[PDB]
């Protein structure tokens, strides 16, 4: 398609058809990234680049907002970037202060990163920006055709090579994960959310450096069955406990999680927020 458009921020896409999900030997199949499936879309927008510190700032000196890590009064922030620890994750630790003005808690900010993705934003906190944008938060099939950039079944948003040509096109982890972060990419953290080539509906960033909230309630078997509901528009199940995130991070790694593979998915519930979760908007025409 070349009936894309870029207006503001985001870019038009005119509709269309791809095929969503993925059957890869290296996926996790219980995450429902699966079965592959054909899936087609209305018109929509969507942003070009996660919302950035300085977007969110201005969010919040307009309205007053108070995020739901404030309200808490901490969140998740990686180990070594300064029981509190996840049992299955323990490289996550629960640090009071830590918010998207404080990304590691006390003693950090955001001064010298003002482009960069706003993080310890839950899905609240999203939707809340979102709306005061006069925008929305992207489906998960709006997400991940728009992260697909025009390619049929590709493992990453521009094809099937990690590094093409050795070159890095996004912001995740080399090294020995979760020790020493070689930052071979130019990152040990976010990058700013013009880093690394777009892909070709003009995203920056739709695999890696964070990870995006989506609307969909998570589910790992709702979109199984063929339907009109589950492959034209399709919005995810009407409940569920988690939302949906798309994209990974700067923390991912083969050695343990794959998912800036654009089939991969994973969830969290909505008031959760952590130093590697950001998001995207959409919108519609
Ligand atoms: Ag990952
Ligand atoms: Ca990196
Ligand atoms: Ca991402």
Redesign the pocket.
């Given at each position: 398609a070349e009936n894309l458009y870029f207006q503001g921020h985001m870019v038009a896409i005119p509709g269309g058809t791809f095929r969503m999900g993925g059957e890869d030997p290296d996926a996790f199949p219980e995450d429902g990234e699966g079965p592959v499936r054909t899936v087609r879309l209305s018109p929509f927008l969507i942003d070009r680049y996660?919302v950035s510190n300085r977007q969110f700032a201005a969010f919040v000196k307009a309205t007053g907002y108070v995020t739901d890590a404030e309200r808490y009064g901490w969140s998740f922030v990686f180990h070594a970037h300064v029981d509190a620890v996840v049992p299955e994750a323990p490289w996550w630790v629960a640090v009071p202060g830590a918010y998207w003005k404080a990304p590691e808690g006390p003693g950090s900010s955001i001064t010298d990163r003002p482009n960069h993705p706003v993080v310890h934003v839950s899905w609240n906190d999203a939707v809340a920006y979102a709306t005061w944008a006069g925008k929305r938060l992207p489906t998960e099939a709006e997400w991940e055709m728009a992260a697909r950039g025009g390619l049929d079944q590709a493992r990453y948003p521009w094809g099937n090579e990690l590094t093409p040509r050795g070159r890095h096109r996004?912001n995740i982890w080399q090294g020995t994960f979760p020790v020493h972060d070689t930052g071979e990419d130019g990152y040990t953290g976010t990058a700013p959310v013009n880093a690394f080539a777009p892909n070709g509906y003009g995203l920056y960033?739709?695999?890696?450096?964070?990870?995006?909230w989506c609307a969909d309630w998570w589910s790992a078997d709702w979109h199984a069955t063929e339907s009109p509901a589950t492959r034209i528009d399709p919005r995810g199940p009407e409940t569920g406990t988690a939302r949906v995130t798309?994209?990974?991070?700067f923390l991912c790694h083969e050695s343990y999680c794959n998912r800036?593979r654009v089939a991969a998915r994973t969830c969290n519930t909505p008031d959760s927020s952590a130093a590697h979760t950001?998001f995207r908007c959409a919108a519609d025409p």
């Open positions: 996660a996004c960033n739709v695999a890696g450096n964070v990870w995006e798309k994209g990974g991070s800036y950001g």
